């Protein structure tokens, strides 16, 4: 079995990685079609909410 403290550390590390990836996508994609960009960002924000 996996201790829930290790799971908590894994979850926070995954959350930090997800924020880094989301902001990297924002930085390297701002300017891609607006609709696809908006859909991908909505997916990323749903991921943020679920991770929270």
């Amino acid at each position: 079995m996996t201790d829930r403290l290790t799971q908590l550390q894994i979850c926070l590390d995954q959350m930090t990685e997800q924020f880094c990836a989301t902001l990297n996508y924002i930085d390297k994609n701002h300017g891609v079609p607006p609709e696809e960009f908006s859909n991908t960002i909505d997916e990323l924000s749903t991921d943020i909410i679920l991770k929270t």
């Binding site: 924002i26 300017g31 607006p34 924000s45």
Partner: protein, 43 residues
């Protein structure tokens, strides 16, 4: 080309933060009041 990139990225960022504010209000109503102030802090 640089100016068009600037305008497109400004529009993209505007829609980003509009959608993020809307959803933060939706799932977190208790934080709704600061978020609008955040807009007032940004806009």
């Amino acid at each position: 080309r640089s100016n068009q990139y600037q305008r497109g990225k400004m529009h993209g960022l505007k829609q980003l933060r509009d959608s993020l504010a809307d959803k933060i209000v939706d799932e977190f109503p208790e934080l709704k009041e600061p978020v609008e102030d955040i807009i007032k802090r940004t806009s």
